Write a protein that binds this ligand. Structure first.
Ligand SMILES: Nc1ncnc2c1ncn2[C@@H]1O[C@H](COP(=O)(O)OP(=O)(O)NP(=O)(O)O)[C@@H](O)[C@H]1O
Ligand SMILES: Nc1ncnc2c1ncn2[C@@H]1O[C@H](COP(=O)(O)OP(=O)(O)NP(=O)(O)O)[C@@H](O)[C@H]1O
Ligand SMILES: Nc1ncnc2c1ncn2[C@@H]1O[C@H](COP(=O)(O)OP(=O)(O)NP(=O)(O)O)[C@@H](O)[C@H]1O
Ligand SMILES: [Mg+2]
Ligand SMILES: [Mg+2]
Ligand SMILES: [Mg+2]
Lengths: 597, 473, 139
DNA sequence: AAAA
DNA sequence: TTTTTTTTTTTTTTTTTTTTTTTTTT
């Protein structure tokens, strides 16, 4: 217990430490956390952590006698979990509200006192930076971006001028305006305290030829006081303090784990069922967010009832609605997902745009966006050009295709890479080329059937086809249970209302939890016979070879040539090719009568 | 003070001029200091030596205070009158100058001046030159000898580019190693094919010149191709391995005055792979010849000058369909070893069919992001590399894998148009009508383009149209 | 600043707090039928489109332009011979709304089919915040 | 009044 | 066809600082 004497800063840490309640030493699960924090902060002063362990907190009789071996192996702690001394300071602030500030003002006054005493009244662009970092070392953080220029991130606290829904989350600032104000507002009282201390020491008669010393010192400090409000001095202090606030390995850890969502009233965690909202400090790095507040799913809310009834009025089937809701609920997850894509069509004014737009707006701009249909209906562009509207998929969670045309063929090359649990590379305008981890739940909307020219299991492993049944008309007719009356208030309003968005978000997270508890986590486990029956019926069509065999039928060379007339006169015209039919028909039903010779 | 600080921290920092002409700072990373993950014992690029700023503003004060106390001691000693005035003036000037050390512009000027002292010529071009050193998550690994030696202490090799994967010796008793080996065995049924594929993949760690070869292997759905390929590409890391665009291979010439910015994706990259394909893309039989040859290739990146570098990478492509080669010269067919997968995964496996197994989606969705599996796979890779080194010399065109050569020969028999017509519609006089019949048959079938080589009176005729065939005009 | 929050529409000609930056250069006055310009415009409007019911809808359709929120999926196209005043009326609407809120759109957006994903285009970017658009096709 |  | 424009290419630097600074001690 002598290493604490090597530096008073560890003694200030101990002063904060003894404020911690002794109840921490018991109920180990929230005792080992402080050990984790002190260990991952720096391993050089770990013997101070062992000193705290053997410090005799609470009582030695709770199993911690002669130290516990759960500490010895904790010296390694080679993991990725991060808890810093910021949590320790927050916990110390939780208890004894009138002790934290009065115990940190020692230190605040101290460091400035040694700086102003060793170098007389002169103050430069590092002493102020050190004191400022000593004051607010938790609200700010600095890291280098890709381009190599320093950036500033500020933690947001309640009761502060801020944008909507940025609470308890890091914000990106080009210049720390809050810090430029703090350096000139709250530092002034510290300097006034220094001046009054100097005056008090002047008042007491000590001796001759030393009260003169406390006149040169006073004059120098009076000259140096006004330098704070100077613009250039503040800029220099900020430039020098950029190094102190630097936190290595922070940019690449921003918004990484897909189990954290930034919402309008904090950050949402879906790691554990049920999901827990966070409204107190925390330490996880989150920058992107949505402006939608989160409330637990309660069906008694009038908007929840209205939205559930509207959902019931769109999908008549019960298994189909459950499958669709389960698939859509994966949009909140931003990690690796199953290689599946839903495309479904129907008549006009069926409300598909309503549901898709509602999901996109509930998720928000950062997590979801719309995508152009040219990514599907057009061939791949050459490697030299930088592709935009494709890296729009980077970091998103949900994307929907709404535009449609007449009978068009899907480019089944983007499909194999844009529906896949793999990696995709691209390059945006005025930038190099890079590859980004791909996570996105996609859905396609149309009123005309797509064209699929392939038959391999690679493409048909994914894809699920559905057909809308209900139909809205301005003057609905009697009978026709698949016919109903429009409510234009669903599109022109009922979707800008924040409360409806909150209710839909609650429904979506509830469905995610339901999919998590049962059916494990996989989506190829829920039994909805209608969807795969419709998909198989769709796959029965769009398969020209089997239809040709059934409808109309020596040498294998006569094949392809005989299929050409059907291919041109019927089922479109197109241009005839071979070297694929010779393999498909070979691996098909046309074998018993097939003439291999 | 620039001279003094160079004398103080001369063994930890180094400065060299980049291509654009801007001085950059490199520092040696040592244990016990804040750092990014897995960058220990390696040189780290520094835009501004903030560590040097902290050092000059923190530790230099000790030497300055030592000089102050030395001056005080000298003044305190009994002396003459003129000497004491000189020492008083010296102390006054020294403290007035000492006040300047914490200034920002003064520190920037000191850094600017010290840029010259710290400079060491021929450093950027010597970074990551030898391909026998790899930057790993816990140091640097050397494959110079057998077995490989891991360096976890001080050294002097200029290593800057690394991967975030720790290295442990190959232990088959580890549960992760056994699970990975069992999955690998399940992926590839044949023993010889599995050994050949592992030997080919293991060369990806070596970053030097390799033999001109390339592997194409296709299959249906749920074959594990993406799993293995992504596992390799990710365990190597972003710096050493990357994904390649299929259009970079299947397309035509890019215009000479247009920067590529995608060809550089393999500049210094030790491994690259192609994922997707359409129905039938004709292989370019060019723009690949240089990327496979152990030679030099030239291209221009974004907003830079024309540059050339050496081709050093291992290539593999996955497909759901056969490619179109449309060439028969020995140059192209020397490479392109071809394989076909046999295992197939479906959620309802059919009994009595050994070529059928059940999925474990935890192989793709998880078991990849887990660091321990990646460490086990890296151990597998390094063990396979050392095994390929100890026997078979070092050449890879020596391992006996008759399945791969048989499959490559069978694929060569197909896609080859020289005997197709002579077998289906041999006619039996410079074969002008014969070549027109050849072209009209292949059109819309094998070769939709009219034949323009007049090559049927050449090594083509030497292949199958010889003996009875005549060519006198 | 003109406010159409509640009937009758109010003009805020004094200090306020709404964040308004874009504007048109047309002063607003209450609709007085006795103004000579108003009478002339109404007479010309009645001359152009005879049928009362058709005239009503037309004016209402034009009225919707001022609004800049979500509207209904309706598009109007009307044909005729030369010298019919379609250009006069449409240009009048476009000018009275102003550049910031109204613009003329090229017909190539409707004649062609689509540019590929990587083609930076005018791509109806004139529709960003504009509440009115007209084509005047002639082929 | 000259030097810091 | 379509052909090339766009993307690139610059274009975003200067305003402090410095200087001086009268005063102030010598
Ligand atoms: N459950 C519902 N009950 C009554 N009206 C509804 C319901 N759902 C949607 N509507 C209305 O029906 C209309 C259809 O709107 P929309 O979402 O555009 O369908 P749509 O099929 O995607 N449009 P389209 O692309 O032309 O087929 C709108 O006026 C909606 O307000
Ligand atoms: N040895 C194995 N045993 C069981 N399941 C496996 C094995 N290897 C892979 N899988 C699973 O099989 C599924 C297919 O993975 P994937 O590699 O994407 O298929 P693929 O055929 O190689 N890619 P693609 O050809 O485009 O369909 C995944 O869910 C894997 O987790
Ligand atoms: N209400 C009106 N009473 C009398 N003359 C009118 C009236 N409105 C328009 N005109 C005149 O009729 C002309 C024809 O109008 P104009 O807009 O040029 O027709 P247009 O069809 O829109 N253009 P175009 O397609 O080339 O004939 C105008 O130029 C006026 O001179
Ligand atoms: Mg719609
Ligand atoms: Mg795969
Ligand atoms: Mg006209």
């Amino acid at each position: 217990s002598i290493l604490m004497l090597h530096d008073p800063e560890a003694r200030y840490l101990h002063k904060i430490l003894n404020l911690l309640p002794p109840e921490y030493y018991v109920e180990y699960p929230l005792w080992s956390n402080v050990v984790f924090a002190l260990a991952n902060t720096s391993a050089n002063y770990r013997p101070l952590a062992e000193w705290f362990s053997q410090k005799c907190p609470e009582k030695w009789n709770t199993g911690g006698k002669e130290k516990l071996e759960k500490l010895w192996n904790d010296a390694s702690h080679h993991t990725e979990k991060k808890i810093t001394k910021r949590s320790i300071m927050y916990w110390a602030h939780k208890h004894a509200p009138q002790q934290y500030k009065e115990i940190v003002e020692q230190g605040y006054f101290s460091i400035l006192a040694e700086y102003v005493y060793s170098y007389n009244g002169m103050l430069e662009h590092y002493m102020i930076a050190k004191v400022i970092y000593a004051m607010m070392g938790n609200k700010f953080v600095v890291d280098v971006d890709s381009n190599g220029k320093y950036v500033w991130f500020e933690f947001v606290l309640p009761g502060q001028p801020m944008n909507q829904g940025e609470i308890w989350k890091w914000r990106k600032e080009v210049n720390p305006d809050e810090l430029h104000i703090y350096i000139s507002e709250n530092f002034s009282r510290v300097m006034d305290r220094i001046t009054e201390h100097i005056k008090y020491h002047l008042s007491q008669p000590h001796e001759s030829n030393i009260l003169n010393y406390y006149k040169k010192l006073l004059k120098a400090f009076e000259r140096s006081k006004s330098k704070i409000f100077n613009d250039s001095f503040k800029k220099g202090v900020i430039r020098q303090a950029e190094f102190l606030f630097r936190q290595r390995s922070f940019i690449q850890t921003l918004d990484t784990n897909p189990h954290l969502l930034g919402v309008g009233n904090g950050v949402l965690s879906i790691e554990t069922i049920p999901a827990k909202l966070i409204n107190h400090f925390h330490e996880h790095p989150i920058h992107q967010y949505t402006h939608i507040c989160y409330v637990p799913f309660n069906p008694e809310n009038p908007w929840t009832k209205l939205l559930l009834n509207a959902l019931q009025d769109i999908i008549p089937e019960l298994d189909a609605r459950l499958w669709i809701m389960f698939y859509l609920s994966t949009a909140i997850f931003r990690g690796l997902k199953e290689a599946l894509m839903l495309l479904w069509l129907g008549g006009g004014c069926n409300g598909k745009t309503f549901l898709m737009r509602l999901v996109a707006m509930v998720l928000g701009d950062h997590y979801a966006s719309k995508l152009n249909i040219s990514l599907l209906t057009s061939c791949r562009e050459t490697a030299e050009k930088p592709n935009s509207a494709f890296m729009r998929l980077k970091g998103r969670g949900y994307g929907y295709f709404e535009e449609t045309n007449k009978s068009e063929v899907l480019n089944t090359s983007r499909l194999k890479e844009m529906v896949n649990p793999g990696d995709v590379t691209a390059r945006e305008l005025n930038q190099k080329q890079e590859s980004f981890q791909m996570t996105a739940t996609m859905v396609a909307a149309s009123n005309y059937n797509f064209i699929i020219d392939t038959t391999d299991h690679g493409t048909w492993r994914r894809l699920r086809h559905y057909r809308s049944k209900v139909k809205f008309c301005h003057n609905p007719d009697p009978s026709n249970p698949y016919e109903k009356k429009e409510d234009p208030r669903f599109i022109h309003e009922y979707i800008m209302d924040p409360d409806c968005q909150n209710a839909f978000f609650s429904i979506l997270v509830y469905f995610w939890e339901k999919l998590q508890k049962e059916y494990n986590g996989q989506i190829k486990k829920v039994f909805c016979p209608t969807i795969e029956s419709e998909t198989e019926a769709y796959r029965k069509s769009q398969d020209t070879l089997h239809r040709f065999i059934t409808e109309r039928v020596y040498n294998l060379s006569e094949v392809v040539t005989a299929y050409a007339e059907w291919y041109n006169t019927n089922i479109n015209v197109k241009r005839h090719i071979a070297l694929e039919l010779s393999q498909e028909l070979e691996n098909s039903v046309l074998e018993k009568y097939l003439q291999w010779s | 003070i620039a001279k003094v600080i160079y004398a103080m921290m001369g063994n930890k920092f180094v400065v060299d001029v980049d291509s654009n002409g801007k001085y950059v700072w490199f520092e040696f990373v040592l244990p016990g200091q804040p750092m990014n993950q897995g960058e220990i014992w390696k040189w780290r690029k520094e835009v501004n030596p903030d560590e040097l700023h902290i050092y000059i503003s923190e530790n230099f004060s000790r030497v300055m205070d030592r000089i102050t106390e030395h001056i005080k001691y000298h003044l305190s000693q009994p002396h003459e009158s003129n000497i004491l005035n000189y020492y008083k003036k010296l102390l006054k000037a020294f403290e007035r100058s000492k006040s300047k050390i914490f200034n920002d512009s003064f520190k920037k000027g000191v850094i600017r001046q010290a840029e010259f002292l710290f400079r060491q010529r021929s450093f950027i071009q010597t970074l990551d030159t030898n391909p026998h050193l790899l930057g790993v998550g816990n140091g640097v690994l050397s494959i110079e000898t057998i077995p490989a030696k891991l360096i976890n202490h001080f050294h002097e090799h200029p290593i800057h580019q690394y991967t975030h994967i720790c290295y442990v010796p190959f232990n088959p008793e580890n549960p992760w190693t056994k699970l990975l080996l069992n999955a690998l065995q399940d992926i590839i049924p044949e023993l010889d094919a599995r050994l050949w594929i592992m030997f080919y993949l293991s060369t990806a760690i070596f970053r030097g010149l390799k033999e001109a070869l390339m592997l194409l292997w296709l299959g249906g759905g749920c074959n594990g191709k993406t799993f293995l390929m992504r596992l390799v590409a990710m365990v190597l890391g972003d710096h050493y391995a990357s994904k390649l665009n299929i259009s970079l291979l299947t397309s035509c010439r890019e215009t000479a005055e247009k920067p590529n910015s995608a060809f550089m994706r393999l500049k210094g990259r030790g491994y690259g792979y192609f994922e997707e394909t359409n129905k039938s893309e004709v292989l370019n039989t060019s723009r690949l010849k240089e990327m496979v040859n152990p030679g030099d290739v030239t291209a221009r990146e974004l907003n830079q000058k024309q540059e050339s570098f050496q081709m050093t990478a291992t290539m593999v492509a996955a497909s759901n369909y056969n490619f179109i080669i449309d060439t028969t010269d020995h140059g192209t067919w020397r490479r392109l070893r071809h394989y076909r997968s046999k295992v197939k995964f479906c959620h309802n496996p059919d009994p009595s069919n050994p070529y059928e197994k059940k999925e474990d989606p935890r192989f793709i969705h998880e078991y990849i992001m887990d660091p321990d599996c990646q460490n086990a796979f890296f151990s597998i890779l390094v063990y396979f590399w050392e095994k390929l080194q100890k026997e078979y010399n070092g050449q890879i065109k020596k391992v006996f894998c008759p399945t791969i050569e048989s499959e490559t020969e069978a694929y060569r028999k197909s896609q080859d148009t020289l005997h197709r017509f002579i077998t289906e519609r041999v006619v039996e006089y410079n074969l002008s009508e014969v070549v027109t019949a050849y072209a009209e048959w292949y059109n819309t079938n094998i070769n939709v383009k009219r034949h323009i080589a007049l090559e049927l009176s050449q090594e083509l005729e030497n292949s199958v149209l010889e003996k009875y065939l005549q060519w006198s005009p």
